[PDB]
Design an enzyme around this catalytic site. Structure first.
Site, mmCIF file in Angstrom:
data_model
loop_
_atom_site.group_PDB
_atom_site.id
_atom_site.type_symbol
_atom_site.label_atom_id
_atom_site.label_comp_id
_atom_site.label_asym_id
_atom_site.label_seq_id
_atom_site.Cartn_x
_atom_site.Cartn_y
_atom_site.Cartn_z
ATOM 1 N N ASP A 116 -19.830 6.442 4.324
ATOM 2 C CA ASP A 116 -18.769 5.627 4.891
ATOM 3 C C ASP A 116 -18.316 6.226 6.224
ATOM 4 O O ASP A 116 -18.908 7.179 6.736
ATOM 5 C CB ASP A 116 -17.618 5.489 3.892
ATOM 6 C CG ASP A 116 -17.111 6.827 3.396
ATOM 7 O OD1 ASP A 116 -17.669 7.863 3.801
ATOM 8 O OD2 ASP A 116 -16.154 6.841 2.594
HETATM 9 C C1 LIG Z 1 -0.847 19.217 9.506
HETATM 10 C C2 LIG Z 1 -0.007 17.972 9.233
HETATM 11 C C3 LIG Z 1 -0.692 16.634 9.568
HETATM 12 C C4 LIG Z 1 -1.072 15.773 8.334
HETATM 13 C C5 LIG Z 1 -0.240 14.470 8.138
HETATM 14 C C6 LIG Z 1 -1.062 13.161 7.915
HETATM 15 C C7 LIG Z 1 -0.822 12.419 6.557
HETATM 16 C C8 LIG Z 1 -1.618 11.092 6.336
HETATM 17 C C9 LIG Z 1 -2.120 10.812 4.881
HETATM 18 C C10 LIG Z 1 -1.911 9.356 4.364
HETATM 19 C C11 LIG Z 1 -2.400 8.218 5.302
HETATM 20 C C12 LIG Z 1 -3.487 7.294 4.726
HETATM 21 O O1 LIG Z 1 -4.354 7.712 4.004
HETATM 22 S S1 LIG Z 1 -3.435 5.496 5.176
HETATM 23 C C13 LIG Z 1 -4.828 4.459 4.467
HETATM 24 C C14 LIG Z 1 -4.853 3.020 5.043
HETATM 25 N N1 LIG Z 1 -5.600 2.025 4.250
HETATM 26 C C15 LIG Z 1 -6.374 0.998 4.801
HETATM 27 O O2 LIG Z 1 -6.441 0.912 6.025
HETATM 28 C C16 LIG Z 1 -7.104 0.023 3.880
HETATM 29 C C17 LIG Z 1 -8.326 -0.724 4.475
HETATM 30 N N2 LIG Z 1 -9.468 0.157 4.748
HETATM 31 C C18 LIG Z 1 -9.987 0.337 6.044
HETATM 32 O O3 LIG Z 1 -9.431 -0.286 6.943
HETATM 33 C C19 LIG Z 1 -11.199 1.273 6.309
HETATM 34 O O4 LIG Z 1 -11.988 1.055 5.194
HETATM 35 C C20 LIG Z 1 -10.832 2.784 6.368
HETATM 36 C C21 LIG Z 1 -9.992 3.176 5.162
HETATM 37 C C22 LIG Z 1 -10.053 3.010 7.653
HETATM 38 C C23 LIG Z 1 -12.146 3.710 6.387
HETATM 39 O O5 LIG Z 1 -13.075 3.183 7.177
HETATM 40 P P1 LIG Z 1 -14.877 3.321 6.807
HETATM 41 O O6 LIG Z 1 -14.809 3.685 5.345
HETATM 42 O O7 LIG Z 1 -15.307 1.923 7.158
HETATM 43 O O8 LIG Z 1 -15.347 4.422 7.735
#
Ligand SMILES: CCCCCCCCCCCC(=O)SCCNC(=O)CCNC(=O)[C@H](O)C(C)(C)COP(=O)(O)O
Ligand SMILES: CCCCCCCCCCCCCCCCCC(=O)OC[C@H](COP(=O)([O-])OCC(O)COP(=O)([O-])OC[C@@H](COC(=O)CCCCCCCCCCCCCCCCC)OC(=O)CCCCCCCCCCCCCCCCC)OC(=O)CCCCCCCCCCCCCCCCC
Ligand SMILES: CCCCCCCCCCCCCCCCC[C@@H](O)O[C@H](CO[C@H](O)CCCCCCCCCCCCCCC)COP(=O)(O)OCC[N+](C)(C)C
Ligand SMILES: CCCCCCCC/C=C/CCCCCCCC(=O)OC[C@H](COP(=O)(O)OCCN)OC(=O)CCCCCCC/C=C/CCCCCCCC
Ligand SMILES: CCCCCCCC/C=C\CCCCCCCC(=O)OC[C@H](COP(=O)(O)OCCN)OC(=O)CCCCCCC/C=C\CCCCCCCC
Lengths: 67, 459, 178, 88, 124, 220, 175, 128, 62, 111, 104
Positions: D43
């Site tokens: 991915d």
């Molecule tokens: C040192 C301190 C810094 C740390 C702080 C940071 C904390 C952040 C942690 C929580 C944030 C998240 O996870 S927020 C997760 C957001 N969810 C979505 O966007 C659902 C739809 N999925 C997609 O758009 C793509 O599949 C994708 C997932 C982008 C992958 O891409 P590929 O699979 O096509 O490569």
């Protein structure tokens, strides 16, 4: 002297650099020990610090609370 | 001192009788010889001045100015022959004629024994300068620049003429020696106050005093390179020379009439230095630099002490040399890229290293690095001001910091960074330009070696 | 630095950029390798927990929350590669870079040394002079009537064509010029 | 002197070394033209981790716009060679 | 330190003032006091050009040490007895100053308590 | 002067203890030592300040030189977070940096000691601002703290630098220069202290705990 | 040397102690001084001897210029230009001479401060007193004249000071 | 949840912390498309002359010319005397002069009064 | 060829400096000033031959 | 003539010779850095002698060799103070500069 | 200009500007050799409070430590010849008031 890259291994060391490093560490420690053995007063102080409370009123010349 | 005046008048027909392809060579050689001859004027006395005749005299204040004028003529000739190559022979001869006439008027101005003759010559210097600016300038703003240069000057100078003729009717003479020996104090009356103002304002506008300087950026930016050289190096010093001459008859009124001009000079020094920090045109920055240095010179003349007069003389000479060098340095880049904007051509140290060295030395002398004569003059003036009042050091101190800031800003913007990608017509420096910079800079350090030659009569 | 940008970034692009930034700043906080691996695996699990959200509104809300948390918890002095735009050697060698057109002004005595280099230079210049008009005409053909909409350039397609606007990309000074 | 004159063969060897130290990629099934999404079934997050691993190996960062595009080890090697002025 | 705590927290009335010291006559509690003598002449100290601060009562030991140092120049490890003598004299000087400070504190504490209790006697 | 020096040395020693660039740490160390010099001038001991200048030149220059050696070996890398275990990979550089750190911290009988120890014990026995004394003591603790940080981060532990290992300090110029400065940092204090005439009045009487104050705060 | 008068620039009798070696070790300073002497001071002395030999074969003299005393600014009529010119020139020469006198005194003071070392505050009292006296006199004579000074302004200053002193003396007499 | 960051003039708001870029509309996408089109057209116009073999000189930039002209020559024609303009001009051009005049006059009057009473300690003040 | 650096960079410059100081600088008063040498008890003066007496019968705090 | 002054002036004077040689055919070769380093080392070993003289007899000097210019009552002259501070700081600075130049011969080899 | 993307292919890389784009009125103030307005980790109005608090606390504590000094429990230093009256400025013709020190 030629030393080639190693790529994820401990680098090549020539005998002379370790000899020099150990020699200078040893001479520093010898200097410290010798200069402490001969000049301990420079660290521990040389003269006894006296205590004011143990000085008699005779030599300090204060009257016996009467005059 | 006709042994200097007559050879210049001979430069005139020598230029007008030369072959079409030897005018620059002949003019340069004989100008340099005339400068060598004028070098003899530095042998001055300790008590009085050299009184050649009833008409001309040489002091320890005017001899370095004459030497500077005669030395500046050949440099202007070398700086002009590049951009005048396509001009016809007659117009080139007319340009050289204008320069020669300007030198002759300047030489006679600094040695006239009477104030009316001095006035006539100091006003005759206007015509060649105005003609040069309005005829051989590049842009359409040159006409307005000429008008500003003319009327700012004349509106100050005409009351001076009225005051001078009045003084001659009152005391019977305008000869400077008689004026000095027969000096009498000025009372505190409105007539005397206006006489003071009439005797001072023309020289104030020549410096120029802050608030009366708007003509200077226009005239010094719109002029050709030789015009800028002679406007910054010599023509601004007419005001200082005339003010040190005329202040002999203004005491004790100056003791309090100097306050507004002193405040204007110090604050406007701060203001013009600050203006230099945000300037998009490279020549306007050098012009405002000139304004700041001349404000310092005005302060020194107004406080009327021996140390301030020594500092004023040294600063005037040093500024003439430094500002002429800076104008030539900017003109080289302008001739390369045909634009005055400072951030257009950058990273020039990569393309022109020796010119970068010349830039560094010029900007180091601009900020008065010791033991340059720039710093000698500035420090003498600062000490005199401190004796005048201990609070001037704050204003003087701020100015020193600001001057360094904008000088190095100019240097870093023009020489460091990365060269602009689209400009590919930056040819190597010619021998002529390098010789011009060397002939500007070497006399500065040579004078540092022997500073009593530029310290004036109060030494 | 080499690719033409787009009009905007997409949601997945933003998530990937935030993921890289968070991993780098966490490595800045976790100096040692094993601790970094532990917390990087934890971060990856946290990132892929909400990977399957079909509501884009809540996805962007989560992205907003994550960006706010990153800004609160970022390293004030993060590690930068020495030649990256904030590194200690970012533009160190820019003063040694000299454009190739400066060679046209060398004195003939200077060009007397290096004859073969200047022969090759003449060959390259002739190549550019011959290919310029074909490049210009290909750009004219491939450009939509309302001007270009991106900064992407077409390649060469014909017999011995060259990709248009190539001279200043091919003749870069160097990365370590002197 | 300084570091040796990096060559294309060395760049490819190091890239393949890093990729074969990855647990989610089988060593033998990996080839120099193997695609990360199609052939290897990774991915986007795995691609980001691979880009960061390349950055660590060569000591220099790669911009995100450029990083997103590379999909096979050939593209990574080509980008590295073009960046560091490697021609042999 | 304890004297600083005693003065800035406890009763500052009976604590000696380092700037204003002493406040009692030098012969107040003592029947007679010997005048502290000096060994090095003003002319000797001037000729040796010691310093305005090293011209204390231990200046003669310093003069001896400097002469021995100049005489034993290349052997810069031979001036130990003279250095020790000078240090001993300076230590005795510091001991005397400590004693002066000690004397001032007891007199102040004793005098003020004695006069306040005499006032108490006069209050009844 | 005393208060300016005290605030400067404390503030810069406080800034140094959390820096990641090694050159920044050494620069803040230099600024803090200049603050200590100013404090020494403020208590009317100019000759001690001059002696401290002469003493500090040696080990400060050699510390910067060892930092430069490490930077050059690891492909112009300056961040300590990417410097691993160089105690064994860089024996002579490690020895020189350890000696310089021990001298900077005023270890007994080293070059640093013949100036810094006297400076601290003269600050303690003077009529002076109490806040300035407290800041001087806190700063001389923070000095040992920052020096420790460089050694732990730069020389101990496991490697964190890129895998193409180009570490090589076998060059006679580097070895000779650092060796000369190292001999200086070991013996100059004793030699110069014993070879100058006494221009001060020494403190020969101290409470035992105050005589050891510098050592105690360094150890803490 | 005899180049300058030792009364205008005096110095103390220069007492220096004799060397008293107290160590078996040799003195490196003496060995280095012998080397410097034999290697530097002798060739320089020979070159100077040659140069002075050449100089003695061509000897000529230059004379200090003498100036007569002319009437002062007080003995000049109000508008008499020639007498005023001569008086002003003489006054300017005297001003230069007074500046040089102050310079000589300041040189004495600086030399004393360097020479006396750590005892300068006590051993240079006489030079400081002389400088204070000369500075007071010079200040009265020329300070505050300002640029464009002349003999007439100095005379006006002196007359004002005399008037103030006479008034103060007469008022103190009435006390 | 976490402490909030508020932007200032000299410390602006980050792009990733900007609410306006997290609630978007097709109008916004159209605007971004037009902005990119204008940028690309300018870039192509520049690059066509940049790579031209026969071009020797400086490529003229109308944006630079407009900037310098606006900063220098266009200012006075667009000036109106307003209460704000008049007040700012009067303040910043007049206040400093009389402020410094008052300061210097007071200092020199004090010095002169001290000199008149004969107590200034002008000893050794030979040069002025 | 071997030790010509010590001749053109040390010996020649010190010849010019010593000549310039011995016969030109010291030809004017107060140009080279040296602080007076320290005098200690028991010393003898080179010029006059005067000896300095000893120091007032130390109390002998042995 | 009491070599203290001559040696103290020669130490400073010999440092300027490589500056005057900056327009010669030594500045265009690869021997220039070693030449400068050798000059600095020679200056240090020369300055070691006045330090020994001071440590032996405490000798100090001031040298006003050149009179640059004179004001009405103020004389400005090129003057050097050769007391304890100068004669102690010069050898230390020269030693450190020698070591650092030899280091730079290796550190800046690719410049 | 510091806030502009450094990974973009600007026409002028150092200035981070593109040919023909509108130039900010205050570009020369923002050339990134100068005033920087880039976002900071800690908020403005919080850095100012901490810095001013540190400075004010340090100044107040220095004043307090001056009015509450630190010293050793000793008397003043004693100098033999009437506090070296002749050494600190001479004046040998006034016979100063004697300064006398006694043993203890
Ligand atoms: C040192 C301190 C810094 C740390 C702080 C940071 C904390 C952040 C942690 C929580 C944030 C998240 O996870 S927020 C997760 C957001 N969810 C979505 O966007 C659902 C739809 N999925 C997609 O758009 C793509 O599949 C994708 C997932 C982008 C992958 O891409 P590929 O699979 O096509 O490569
Ligand atoms: C102080 C040392 C004393 C040395 C003794 C002998 C000195 C002889 C020098 C004669 C005068 C210099 C000539 C000026 C023009 C420059 C020549 C040139 O164009 O370069 C081509 C030439 C050819 O080499 P290149 O490969 O082609 O390089 C060209 C590239 O552009 C790359 O070029 P670059 O990168 O090499 O840079 C060129 C160089 C040259 O550029 C310059 O800036 C040099 C000009 C000096 C600055 C001018 C303004 C500052 C005001 C100070 C005034 C001092 C002058 C005193 C009177 C001198 C009379 C001539 O600039 C610098 O390297 C640094 C400049 C910063 C100088 C800082 C010093 C401040 C003052 C220090 C003390 C000064 C008073 C001494 C006494 C004090 C009390 C004891 O370059 C050189 O050979 C190097 C130049 C030599 C450097 C001189 C710097 C020190 C000298 C200061 C004044 C002299 C004092 C003499 C009294 C004795 C003491
Ligand atoms: C933009 C830059 C231009 C150049 C700057 C030129 C500077 C010119 C300023 C002139 C300096 C002083 C001029 C007159 C001297 C004193 C001024 C006056 O205000 O002082 C008081 C004067 O009192 C009152 O102020 C009366 C004057 C009031 C009328 C003057 C008009 C001022 C209004 C400002 C107009 C701006 C003038 C500049 C035009 C650009 C002193 O009291 P008094 O003792 O009784 O008068 C002294 C003369 N005596 C002895 C003969 C009696
Ligand atoms: C005494 C009179 C004036 C005293 C000083 C008052 C403030 C002076 C104001 C100067 C204005 C200058 C404007 C233009 C300067 C040039 C532009 C500039 O320098 O921009 C800032 C530039 C770049 O920023 P960096 O942090 O380095 O970022 C680099 C990585 N990107 O950095 C600087 O140079 C900023 C320097 C400004 C310092 C001004 C503040 C100093 C005030 C000192 C007060 C304390 C006095 C000390 C008291 C001592 C005890 C007696
Ligand atoms: C080159 C190699 C030369 C080899 C042969 C020369 C050997 C010795 C030559 C002796 C020459 C005779 C001589 O110099 O006598 C002194 C003679 C004249 O006496 P003045 O002091 O100038 O009188 C007052 C006038 N101002 O002085 C000189 O001419 C030599 C001066 C050289 C000084 C040394 C260099 C220092 C000057 C550097 C410039 C610095 C700029 C200004 C500094 C300001 C300092 C406050």
């Amino acid at each position: 002297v030629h030393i080639e890259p190693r790529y994820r291994q401990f680098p090549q060391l020539t005998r002379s650099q370790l000899i020099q490093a150990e020699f200078f560490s040893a001479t520093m420690w010898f200097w410290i020990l010798w200069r402490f053995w001969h000049d301990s007063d420079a660290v521990l102080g040389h003269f006894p610090y006296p205590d004011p409370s143990q000085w008699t009123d005779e030599e300090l010349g204060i009257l016996p609370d009467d005059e | 001192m006709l042994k200097i005046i007559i050879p210049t008048t001979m430069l005139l027909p020598m230029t007008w009788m030369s072959k079409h392809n030897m005018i620059w060579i002949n003019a340069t050689v004989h100008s340099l010889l005339i400068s060598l001859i004028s070098l003899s004027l530095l042998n001055q006395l300790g008590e009085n001045s050299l009184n050649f005749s009833l008409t001309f005299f040489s002091d320890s204040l005017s001899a370095p100015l004459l030497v500077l004028t005669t030395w500046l003529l050949p440099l202007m000739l070398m700086a002009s022959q590049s951009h005048l190559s396509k001009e016809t022979t007659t117009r080139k001869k007319l340009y050289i004629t204008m320069l020669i006439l300007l030198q002759l008027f300047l030489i006679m101005t600094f040695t006239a024994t009477e104030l009316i003759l001095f006035y006539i010559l100091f006003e005759a210097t206007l015509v060649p300068t105005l003609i040069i600016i309005t005829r051989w300038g590049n842009q359409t703003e040159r006409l307005n620049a000429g008008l500003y240069f003319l009327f700012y000057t004349l509106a100050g100078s005409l009351p001076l003429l009225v005051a001078l003729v009045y003084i001659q009717n009152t005391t019977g003479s305008l000869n400077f020696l008689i004026i000095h020996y027969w000096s009498h104090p000025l009372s505190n009356s409105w007539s005397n106050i206006f006489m003071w103002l009439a005797c001072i304002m023309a020289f104030m506008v020549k410096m120029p005093l802050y608030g009366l300087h708007l003509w200077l950026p226009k005239a010094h930016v719109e002029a050709p390179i030789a015009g800028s050289m002679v406007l910054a190096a010599v023509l601004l010093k007419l005001g200082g020379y005339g003010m040190m001459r005329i202040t002999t008859i203004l005491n004790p009124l100056t003791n309090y009439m100097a306050y507004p001009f002193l405040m204007l000079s110090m604050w406007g020094m701060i203001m013009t230095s600050s203006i230099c920090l945000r300037q998009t045109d490279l020549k306007s920055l050098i012009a405002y630099s000139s304004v700041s240095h001349m404000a310092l010179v005005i302060v020194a003349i107004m406080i009327q002490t021996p140390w301030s007069f020594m500092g004023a003389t040294a600063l005037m000479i040093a500024h003439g040399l430094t500002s002429s060098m800076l104008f030539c340095l900017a003109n080289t880049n302008y001739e390369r890229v045909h634009s005055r904007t400072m951030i257009l051509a950058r990273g020039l140290q990569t393309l022109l290293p020796l010119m970068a060295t010349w830039w560094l030395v010029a900007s180091l002398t601009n900020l008065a690095l010791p033991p340059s004569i720039n710093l000698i003059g500035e420090l003498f003036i600062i000490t005199a001001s401190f004796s005048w009042s201990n609070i001037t050091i704050i204003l003087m101190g701020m100015n020193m910091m600001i001057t360094a800031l904008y000088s190095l800003y100019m240097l870093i913007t023009t020489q460091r960074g990365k060269y602009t990608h689209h400009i590919n017509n930056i040819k190597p420096s010619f021998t002529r330009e390098n010789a011009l910079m060397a002939l500007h800079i070497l006399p500065l350090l040579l004078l540092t070696l022997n500073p009593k030659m530029i310290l004036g009569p109060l030494y | 630095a080499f690719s033409a940008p787009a009009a905007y970034l997409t949601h997945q692009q933003k998530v990937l950029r935030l993921y890289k930034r968070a991993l780098r700043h966490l490595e800045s906080w976790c100096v040692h390798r094993d601790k970094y691996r532990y917390f990087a695996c934890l971060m990856r699990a946290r990132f892929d927990e909400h990977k399957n959200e079909k509501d884009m509104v809540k996805a962007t809300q989560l992205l907003r929350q994550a960006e706010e948390e990153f800004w609160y918890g970022q390293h004030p002095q993060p590690y930068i590669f020495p030649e990256s735009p904030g590194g200690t050697s970012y533009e160190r060698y820019e003063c040694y870079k000299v454009p190739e057109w400066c060679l046209d002004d060398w004195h003939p005595s200077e060009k007397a040394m290096y004859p073969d280099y200047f022969a090759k230079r003449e060959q390259w210049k002739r190549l550019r002079r011959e290919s310029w008009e074909r490049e210009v005409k290909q750009l004219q053909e491939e450009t939509p009537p309302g001007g270009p909409r991106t900064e992407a350039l077409p390649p060469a397609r014909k017999e011995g064509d060259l990709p248009p606007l190539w001279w200043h990309i091919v003749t870069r000074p160097r990365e370590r010029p002197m | 002197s300084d570091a040796p004159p990096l060559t294309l063969e060395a760049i490819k060897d190091r890239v393949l070394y890093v990729l074969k130290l990855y647990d989610k990629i089988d060593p033998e099934k990996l080839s120099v033209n193997s695609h990360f999404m199609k052939d290897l079934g990774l991915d986007s997050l795995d691609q980001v981790e691979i880009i960061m691993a390349m950055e660590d190996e060569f000591g220099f960062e790669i911009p995100d716009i450029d990083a997103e595009k590379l999909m096979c080890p050939q593209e990574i090697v080509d980008y590295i060679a073009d960046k560091k002025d490697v021609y042999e | 330190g304890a004297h600083l705590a005693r003065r800035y927290l406890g009763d500052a009335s009976k604590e000696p003032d380092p700037l204003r010291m002493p406040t009692f006559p030098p012969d107040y509690g003592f029947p007679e006091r010997k005048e502290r003598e000096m060994v090095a002449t003003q002319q000797e100290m001037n000729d040796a050009q010691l310093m305005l601060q090293q011209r204390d009562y231990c200046a003669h030991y310093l003069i001896q040490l400097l002469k021995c140092k100049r005489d034993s120049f290349p052997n810069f490890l031979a001036c130990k007895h003279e250095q020790h003598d000078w240090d001993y004299c300076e230590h005795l000087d510091y001991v005397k100053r400590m004693k002066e400070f000690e004397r001032e504190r007891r007199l102040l504490q004793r005098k003020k308590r004695r006069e306040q209790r005499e006032a108490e006697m006069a209050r009844g | 002067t005393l208060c300016l020096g005290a605030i400067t040395t404390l503030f810069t020693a406080l800034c140094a203890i959390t820096q990641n660039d090694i050159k920044k740490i050494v620069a803040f160390s230099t600024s803090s030592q200049l603050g200590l010099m100013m404090v020494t001038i403020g208590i009317n001991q100019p000759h001690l300040a001059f002696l401290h200048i002469c003493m500090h030149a040696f080990f400060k220059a050699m510390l910067f030189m060892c930092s430069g050696s490490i930077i050059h070996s690891l492909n112009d890398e300056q961040d300590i977070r990417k410097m691993g275990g160089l105690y064994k990979a860089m024996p002579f550089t490690t020895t020189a940096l350890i000696i310089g750190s021990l001298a900077l911290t005023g270890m007994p009988y080293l070059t640093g000691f013949y100036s810094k120890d006297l400076i601290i014990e003269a600050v303690n026995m003077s009529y002076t601002n109490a806040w300035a004394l407290l800041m001087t003591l806190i700063a001389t603790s923070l000095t040992a703290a920052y020096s420790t940080r460089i050694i732990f981060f730069a020389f101990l532990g496991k490697p964190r630098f890129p895998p193409l290992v180009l570490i090589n300090e076998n060059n006679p110029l580097l070895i000779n220069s650092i060796k000369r400065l190292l001999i200086g940092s070991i013996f100059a204090g004793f030699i110069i202290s014993n070879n100058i005439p006494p221009m001060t009045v020494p403190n020969t009487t101290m409470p035992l705990y105050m005589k050891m104050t510098a050592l105690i705060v360094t150890i803490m | 040397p005899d180049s300058w008068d030792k009364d205008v620039y005096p110095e103390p009798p220069r007492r220096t102690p004799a060397p008293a070696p107290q160590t078996s070790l040799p003195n490196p300073v003496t060995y280095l001084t012998k080397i410097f002497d034999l290697l530097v001071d002798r060739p320089v002395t020979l070159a100077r001897e040659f140069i002075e030999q050449q100089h003695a074969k061509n000897r000529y003299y230059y004379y200090h210029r003498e100036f007569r005393r002319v009437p002062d600014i007080t003995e000049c009529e109000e508008k008499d230009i020639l007498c005023m010119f001569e008086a002003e020139m003489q006054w300017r020469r005297d001003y230069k001479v007074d500046q040089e006198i102050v310079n000589i005194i300041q040189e004495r003071l600086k030399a004393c401060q360097q020479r006396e070392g750590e005892s300068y505050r006590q051993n240079c009292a006489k030079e400081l007193e002389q400088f204070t006296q000369v500075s007071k006199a010079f200040q009265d004579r020329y300070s505050d004249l300002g640029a464009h000074y002349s003999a007439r302004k100095c005379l006006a200053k002196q007359k004002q000071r005399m008037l103030a002193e006479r008034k103060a003396a007469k008022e103190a007499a009435a006390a | 949840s976490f402490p909030k960051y508020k932007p200032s003039r000299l410390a602006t708001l980050p792009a990733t912390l900007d609410p306006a870029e997290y609630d978007i509309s097709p109008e916004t996408r159209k605007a971004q498309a037009e902005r990119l089109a204008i940028r690309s057209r300018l870039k192509r116009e520049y690059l066509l002359q940049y790579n031209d073999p026969n071009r020797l000189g400086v490529i003229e930039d109308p944006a630079l010319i407009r900037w310098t002209y606006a900063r220098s020559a266009n200012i006075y024609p667009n000036f109106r005397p307003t209460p704000k303009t008049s007040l700012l001009g009067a303040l910043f051009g007049i206040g400093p002069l009389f402020f410094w005049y008052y300061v210097f006059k007071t200092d020199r009057d004090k010095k002169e009064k001290l000199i008149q009473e004969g107590k200034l300690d002008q000893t050794f003040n030979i040069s002025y | 060829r071997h030790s010509i650096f010590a001749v053109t960079h040390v010996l020649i410059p010190v010849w010019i400096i010593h000549y310039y100081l011995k016969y030109h600088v010291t030809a004017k008063p107060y140009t080279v000033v040296e602080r007076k040498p320290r005098i200690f008890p028991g010393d003898t003066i080179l010029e006059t031959g005067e000896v300095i007496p000893l120091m007032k019968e130390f109390p002998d705090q042995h | 003539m009491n070599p203290f002054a001559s040696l103290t002036l020669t130490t400073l004077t010999i440092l300027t010779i490589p500056i005057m040689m900056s327009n010669s055919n030594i500045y265009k070769t690869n021997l220039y850095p070693n030449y400068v380093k050798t000059t600095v080392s020679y200056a240090f070993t020369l300055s070691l002698v006045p330090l020994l003289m001071f440590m032996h007899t405490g000798q100090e000097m001031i040298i006003s060799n050149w009179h640059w210019m004179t004001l009405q009552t103020v004389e400005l002259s090129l003057s050097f103070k050769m007391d304890y501070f100068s004669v102690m700081f010069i050898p230390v600075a020269l030693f450190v500069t020698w070591s650092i130049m030899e280091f730079s011969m290796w550190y800046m080899h690719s410049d | 200009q510091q806030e502009r993307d450094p990974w973009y292919d600007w026409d002028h890389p150092d200035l981070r500007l593109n040919w023909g784009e509108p130039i900010h009125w205050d570009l020369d103030m923002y050339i990134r050799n100068r005033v920087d307005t880039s976002p900071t980790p800690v908020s403005w109005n919080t850095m100012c409070k901490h810095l001013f608090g540190f400075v004010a606390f340090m100044l107040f504590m220095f004043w307090v430590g001056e009015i509450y000094p630190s010293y050793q429990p000793v008397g003043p230093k004693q100098y033999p010849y009437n506090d070296l009256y002749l050494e600190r400025g001479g004046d040998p013709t006034k016979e100063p008031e004697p300064v006398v020190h006694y043993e203890i």
